[PDB]
Amino acid sequence: VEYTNTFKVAAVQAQPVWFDAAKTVDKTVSNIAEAARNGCELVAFPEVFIPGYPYHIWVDSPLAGMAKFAVRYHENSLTMDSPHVQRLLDAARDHNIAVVVGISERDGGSLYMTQLIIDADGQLVARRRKLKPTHVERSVYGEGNGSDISVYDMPFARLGALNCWEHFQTLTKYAMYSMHEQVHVASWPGMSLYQPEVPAFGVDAQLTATRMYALEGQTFVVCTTQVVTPEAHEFFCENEEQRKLIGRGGGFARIIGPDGRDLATPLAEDEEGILYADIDLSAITLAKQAADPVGHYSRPDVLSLNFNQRRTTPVNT
Amino acid sequence: VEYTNTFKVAAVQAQPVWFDAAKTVDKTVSNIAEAARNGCELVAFPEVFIPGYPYHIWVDSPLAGMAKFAVRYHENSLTMDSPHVQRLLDAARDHNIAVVVGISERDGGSLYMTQLIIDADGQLVARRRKLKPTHVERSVYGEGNGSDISVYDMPFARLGALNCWEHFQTLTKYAMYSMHEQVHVASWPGMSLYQPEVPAFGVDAQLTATRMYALEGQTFVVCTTQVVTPEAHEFFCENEEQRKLIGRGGGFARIIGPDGRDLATPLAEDEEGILYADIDLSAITLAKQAADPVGHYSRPDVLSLNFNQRRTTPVNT
Amino acid sequence: VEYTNTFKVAAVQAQPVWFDAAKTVDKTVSNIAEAARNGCELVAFPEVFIPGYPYHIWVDSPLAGMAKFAVRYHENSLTMDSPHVQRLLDAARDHNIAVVVGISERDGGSLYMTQLIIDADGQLVARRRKLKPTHVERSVYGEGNGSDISVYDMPFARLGALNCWEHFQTLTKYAMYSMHEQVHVASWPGMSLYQPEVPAFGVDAQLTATRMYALEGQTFVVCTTQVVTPEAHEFFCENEEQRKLIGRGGGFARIIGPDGRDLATPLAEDEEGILYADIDLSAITLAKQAADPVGHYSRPDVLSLNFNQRRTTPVNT
Amino acid sequence: VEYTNTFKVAAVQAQPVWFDAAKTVDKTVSNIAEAARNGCELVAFPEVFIPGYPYHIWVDSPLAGMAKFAVRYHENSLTMDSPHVQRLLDAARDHNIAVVVGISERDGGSLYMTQLIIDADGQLVARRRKLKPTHVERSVYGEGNGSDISVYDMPFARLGALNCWEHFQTLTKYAMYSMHEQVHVASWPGMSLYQPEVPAFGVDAQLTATRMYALEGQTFVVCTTQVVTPEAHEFFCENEEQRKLIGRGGGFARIIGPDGRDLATPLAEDEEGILYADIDLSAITLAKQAADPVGHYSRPDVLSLNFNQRRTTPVNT
Amino acid sequence: VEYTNTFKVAAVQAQPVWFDAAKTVDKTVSNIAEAARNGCELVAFPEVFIPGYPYHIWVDSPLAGMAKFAVRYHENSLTMDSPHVQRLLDAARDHNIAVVVGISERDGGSLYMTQLIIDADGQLVARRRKLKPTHVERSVYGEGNGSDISVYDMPFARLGALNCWEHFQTLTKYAMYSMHEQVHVASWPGMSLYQPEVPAFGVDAQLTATRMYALEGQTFVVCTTQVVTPEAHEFFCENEEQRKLIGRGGGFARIIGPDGRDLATPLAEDEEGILYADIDLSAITLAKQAADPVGHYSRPDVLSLNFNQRRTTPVNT
Amino acid sequence: VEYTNTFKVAAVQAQPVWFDAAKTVDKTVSNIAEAARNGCELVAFPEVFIPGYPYHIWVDSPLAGMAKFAVRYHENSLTMDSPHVQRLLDAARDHNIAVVVGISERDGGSLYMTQLIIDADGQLVARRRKLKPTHVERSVYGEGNGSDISVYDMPFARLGALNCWEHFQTLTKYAMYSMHEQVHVASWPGMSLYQPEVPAFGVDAQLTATRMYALEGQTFVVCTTQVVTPEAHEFFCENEEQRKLIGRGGGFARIIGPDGRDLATPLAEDEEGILYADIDLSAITLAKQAADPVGHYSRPDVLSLNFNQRRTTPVNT
Ligand SMILES: *C(=O)c1ccccc1
Ligand SMILES: *C(=O)c1ccccc1
Ligand SMILES: *C(=O)c1ccccc1
Ligand SMILES: *C(=O)c1ccccc1
Ligand SMILES: *C(=O)c1ccccc1
Ligand SMILES: *C(=O)c1ccccc1
Going by their DSSP bridges, the two strands C110-118 and C124-129 should be labelled as: antiparallel
Phi/psi at B164 (5° precision): -55, 130
Instruction: Say if the Cβ atoms of D296 and C110 lie within 8 Å.
Output: yes
User: CA D309 from chain center: how many Å?
Assistant: 21
CB distance B310 to B151 below 8 Å:
no
State the Cα–Cα distance between residues F65 and E208, nearest whole angstrom. 36
Cβ burial, residue F229 (10 Å; 0-12/13-18/19+): buried
| Cβ-proximal residues to C275 (8 Å cutoff; 6+ apart), any chain | C10, C11, C12, C13, C253, C254, C255, C264, C265, C266, C267
Query: Which amino acid is located at C92 in the chain?
Result: A
State the Cα–Cα distance between residues F104 and F52, nearest whole angstrom. 8
Identify which of E16, F314, F166, A301 has the alpha carbon closest to the alpha carbon of residue D144.
A301
Closest residue in chain A to residue F308, using alpha carbons only: A301
Identify which of B47, B62, B235 has the alpha carbon closest to the alpha carbon of residue B139.
B62
CB distance A281 to A3 below 8 Å:
yes
DSSP letter for each residue of C82-95? SHHHHHHHHHHHHH
Identify which of C292, D50, E228 has the alpha carbon closest to the alpha carbon of residue B165.
C292
**Which residues from chain B sit within 8 angstroms of residue D301, using beta carbons?**
301-302
State the Cα–Cα distance between residues C36 and C16, nearest whole angstrom. 20
- 10 Å Cβ neighbour count for B113? 29
- The ligand 3 atom nearest the CA atom of C200: 7
Instruction: Say if the Cβ atoms of B285 and A70 lie within 8 Å.
Output: yes
Chain F: touching chains (3 or more CB pairs < 8 Å): A, D, E
Going by their DSSP bridges, the two strands A6-13 and A273-280 should be labelled as: antiparallel
Instruction: Say if the Cβ atoms of C316 and D295 lie within 8 Å.
Output: no
Please indicate whether residue F165, judged by its CB atom, sits closer than 6 Å to ligand 6: yes
State the Cα–Cα distance between residues C224 and C10, nearest whole angstrom. 9
| Cβ-proximal residues to C19 (8 Å cutoff; 6+ apart), any chain | C51, C52, C69, C72, C73, C76, C235
Distance from CA of E190 to the nearest CA of A (A): 48
Looking at the CA of F132, which ligand is closest?
6
Cα-to-centroid distance, D135 and ligand 4 (Å): 8
| Cβ-proximal residues to A159 (8 Å cutoff; 6+ apart), any chain | A42, A98, A100, A117, A125, A151, A152, A153, A181, A183, A184, A185
Closest residue in chain A to residue B158, using alpha carbons only: A108
Cβ burial, residue E23 (10 Å; 0-12/13-18/19+): middle
For residue B170, give the 3-state DSSP assignment: helix
Phi/psi at B213 (5° precision): -60, -45
Please indicate whether residue F18, judged by its CB atom, sits closer than 6 Å to ligand 6: no
Going by their DSSP bridges, the two strands B6-13 and B42-44 should be labelled as: parallel
Cβ burial, residue D136 (10 Å; 0-12/13-18/19+): buried
| Cβ-proximal residues to D205 (8 Å cutoff; 6+ apart), any chain | A215, A259, A260, D191, D199
| Cβ-proximal residues to B95 (8 Å cutoff; 6+ apart), any chain | B32, B33, B35, B36
Count H helices, E strands: chain B? 10, 14
Instruction: Say if the Cβ atoms of D303 and A216 lie within 8 Å.
Output: no
CB distance C279 to C298 below 8 Å:
no
For residue A118, give the 3-state DSSP assignment: strand
CB distance F16 to F226 below 8 Å:
yes
Cα-to-centroid distance, E275 and ligand 5 (Å): 22
Strand partners, E10: E43, E276
Cβ burial, residue D131 (10 Å; 0-12/13-18/19+): buried
Cβ burial, residue A233 (10 Å; 0-12/13-18/19+): middle
Query: Which amino acid is located at F124 in the chain?
Result: L
State the Cα–Cα distance between residues B265 and B256, nearest whole angstrom. 11
State the Cα–Cα distance between residues B232 and B251, nearest whole angstrom. 13
3-state helix, strand and coil shares in percent for chain A, rounded to the nearest 5: 30, 25, 45
- 10 Å Cβ neighbour count for A239? 9
Identify which of A314, A184, E171 has the alpha carbon closest to the alpha carbon of residue F305.
E171
Deposited resolution, Å? 3.0
Chain C: touching chains (3 or more CB pairs < 8 Å): A, B, D
**Which residues from chain D sit within 8 angstroms of residue C141, using beta carbons?**
296
Looking at the CA of E136, which ligand is closest?
5
User: Using the 8-state DSSP alphabet, how is residue B66 labeled?
Assistant: I
Please indicate whether residue A165, judged by its CB atom, sits closer than 6 Å to ligand 1: yes
The most distant pair of C-alpha atoms in chain A lies apart, rounded to whole Å, by 57
Closest residue in chain A to residue E302, using alpha carbons only: A301
For residue A164, give the 3-state DSSP assignment: helix
Chain A: touching chains (3 or more CB pairs < 8 Å): B, C, D, E, F
User: Using the 8-state DSSP alphabet, how is residue F79 labeled?
Assistant: P
In chain B, after which residues does the backbone break, taking C–N over 2.5 angstroms as a break?
A: none
Phi/psi at F189 (5° precision): -90, 180
Residues of E forming the active site? 47
**Which residues from chain E sit within 8 angstroms of residue D107, using beta carbons?**
295
The distance in angstroms from the start CA to the end CA of chain E is 37
- b/e code B45-63 from CB counts within 10 Å (16+ = b): bbbbbbbbbbbbbbbbeee
User: Using the 8-state DSSP alphabet, how is residue F219 labeled?
Assistant: -
State the Cα–Cα distance between residues D107 and A11, nearest whole angstrom. 52
State the Cα–Cα distance between residues B218 and B216, nearest whole angstrom. 6
State the Cα–Cα distance between residues A89 and A35, nearest whole angstrom. 15
Identify which of A141, A149, A67 has the alpha carbon closest to the alpha carbon of residue A104.
A141
Cβ burial, residue E81 (10 Å; 0-12/13-18/19+): exposed
Our mutation pick for probing the ligand 6 site, out of F137, F163, F195, counting the most ligand atoms within 8 A of Cβ, is: F137
State the Cα–Cα distance between residues B195 and B59, nearest whole angstrom. 12
Cα-to-centroid distance, B171 and ligand 2 (Å): 19
Cα torsion E98, E104, E109, E110: sign: positive
Identify which of D66, B233, D105, A87 has the alpha carbon closest to the alpha carbon of residue E283.
D66
Cα torsion D90, D94, D98, D104: sign: negative
Cα-to-centroid distance, E174 and ligand 6 (Å): 21
Closest residue in chain A to residue D218, using alpha carbons only: A200
DSSP letter for each residue of A62-98? HHHHIIIIIHHHHHTSBPTTSHHHHHHHHHHHHHT-E
| Cβ-proximal residues to F117 (8 Å cutoff; 6+ apart), any chain | F98, F100, F124, F125, F126, F127, F128, F152, F154, F159, F161
Q: How many angstroms separate the Cα of E239 from the Cα of each of A283, D106, E60, E72, E195? A: 78, 59, 10, 21, 17
CB-nearest partner of A285 from F109, F142, F313: F109
- 10 Å Cβ neighbour count for F4? 8
Phi/psi at D29 (5° precision): -65, -40
Please indicate whether residue A236, judged by its CB atom, sits closer than 6 Å to ligand 1: no
Identify which of A87, A20, A15 has the alpha carbon closest to the alpha carbon of residue A273.
A15
For residue A204, give the 3-state DSSP assignment: helix
Residue with the nearest Cα to atom 1 of ligand 4? D164
CB distance E116 to E85 below 8 Å:
yes
Strand partners, A235: none
For residue F54, give the 3-state DSSP assignment: coil
State the Cα–Cα distance between residues F244 and F15, nearest whole angstrom. 19
Torsion of Cα atoms, A104 then A106 then A107 then A108, to 10°: 150
**Which residues from chain E sit within 8 angstroms of residue D66, using beta carbons?**
286, 289
Instruction: Say if the Cβ atoms of D3 and C74 lie within 8 Å.
Output: yes
Distance from CA of D205 to the nearest CA of F (A): 18
**Which residues from chain D sit within 8 angstroms of residue C69, using beta carbons?**
none
Angle between helices D203-217 and D170-178 (to 10 degrees): 30
Complete edge-to-edge strand list for the sheet that includes strand B42-44 = B124-129, B114-118, B98-102, B42-44, B6-13, B273-280
State the Cα–Cα distance between residues A21 and A50, nearest whole angstrom. 6
SS3 annotation, chain E: CCCCCEEEEEEEECCCCCCCHHHHHHHHHHHHHHHHHCCCCEEECCCCCCCCCCCHHHHCCHHHHHHHHHHHHHHCCECCCCHHHHHHHHHHHHHCCEEEEEEEEEECCEEEEEEEEECCCCCEEEEEECCCCCCCHHHCCCCCCHHHCCCEECCCCEEEEEEHHHHHCHHHHHHHHHCCCCEEEEECCCCCECCCCCHHHCHHHHHHHHHHHHHHHCCEEEEEECCECHHHHHHHCCCHHHHHHECCECCCCEEECCCCCECCCCCCCCCCEEEEEEEECHHHHHHCCCCCCCCCCCCCCCEEEEECCCCCCCCCC
Strand partners, B123: none
For Cα atoms B244, B249, B253, give the angle at the middle one, nearest 5 degrees: 145
Residue C233, Ramachandran bin (φ over 0: left; ψ between -120 and 50: alpha; else beta): alpha
State the Cα–Cα distance between residues F148 and F125, nearest whole angstrom. 12
Going by their DSSP bridges, the two strands A303-307 and D303-307 should be labelled as: antiparallel
Complete edge-to-edge strand list for the sheet that includes strand E6-13 = E124-129, E110-118, E98-107, E42-44, E6-13, E273-280
State the Cα–Cα distance between residues D176 and D195, nearest whole angstrom. 30
User: CA C50 from chain center: how many Å?
Assistant: 12
- The ligand 3 atom nearest the CA atom of C194: 6
Identify which of E103, E96, E110 has the alpha carbon closest to the alpha carbon of residue E142.
E110
Please indicate whether residue C164, judged by its CB atom, sits closer than 6 Å to ligand 3: yes
Going by their DSSP bridges, the two strands A183-188 and A220-225 should be labelled as: parallel
CB distance D188 to D164 below 8 Å:
yes
Cα-to-centroid distance, E218 and ligand 4 (Å): 29
Residues shown for chain E: 317
State the Cα–Cα distance between residues B164 and B223, nearest whole angstrom. 10
Identify which of C314, D211, D209, D284 has the alpha carbon closest to the alpha carbon of residue A171.
C314
Identify which of F164, F163, F124, F129 has the alpha carbon closest to the alpha carbon of residue F145.
F129
Our mutation pick for probing the ligand 4 site, out of D187, D191, D208, D236, counting the most ligand atoms within 8 A of Cβ, is: D191
The distance in angstroms from the start CA to the end CA of chain D is 37
State the Cα–Cα distance between residues D258 and D265, nearest whole angstrom. 16
- 10 Å Cβ neighbour count for B314? 5
Going by their DSSP bridges, the two strands A98-107 and A110-118 should be labelled as: antiparallel
Q: How many angstroms separate the Cα of C255 from the Cα of each of C95, C224, C271? A: 22, 9, 16
Residues shown for chain C: 317
Identify which of B160, E160, C56, B190 has the alpha carbon closest to the alpha carbon of residue D289.
C56
| Cβ-proximal residues to B44 (8 Å cutoff; 6+ apart), any chain | B9, B10, B11, B12, B99, B100, B101, B185, B187, B222, B224
Residue F36 parent element (H or E)? helix F21-37
State the Cα–Cα distance between residues E222 and E242, nearest whole angstrom. 31
Going by their DSSP bridges, the two strands B273-280 and C6-13 should be labelled as: unpaired
Looking at the CA of C66, which ligand is closest?
1
Angle between helices C21-37 and C83-95 (to 10 degrees): 10
DSSP letter for each residue of chain D? -----EEEEEEEEE---TT-HHHHHHHHHHHHHHHHHTT-SEEE--TTTTT---THHHHS-HHHHIIIIIHHHHHTSBPTTSHHHHHHHHHHHHHT-EEEEEEEEEETTEEEEEEEEE-TTS-EEEEEEPSS--GGGGGT-----GGGS-EEE-SSSEEEEEEGGGGS-HHHHHHHHHTT--EEEEE-----BTTTT-GGGSHHHHHHHHHHHHHHHT-EEEEEEE-B-HHHHHHH--SHHHHHHB-SB----EEE-TTS-BSS----SS--EEEEEEEETHHHHHHHHH--TTTTT--TTTEEEEE------SB--
Phi/psi at A148 (5° precision): -80, -5
Chains B and F touch (3+ CB pairs under 8 A): no
Please indicate whether residue E141, judged by its CB atom, sits closer than 6 Å to ligand 5: no
Residue with the nearest Cα to atom 2 of ligand 5? E164
For residue C34, give the 3-state DSSP assignment: helix
| Cβ-proximal residues to D7 (8 Å cutoff; 6+ apart), any chain | D40, D41, D42, D156, D157, D278, D279
Cβ burial, residue B230 (10 Å; 0-12/13-18/19+): exposed
| Cβ-proximal residues to F292 (8 Å cutoff; 6+ apart), any chain | F218, F298
Please indicate whether residue A189, judged by its CB atom, sits closer than 6 Å to ligand 1: yes
State the Cα–Cα distance between residues E148 and E185, nearest whole angstrom. 14
Looking at the CA of C162, which ligand is closest?
3
Strand partners, C114: C103, C129
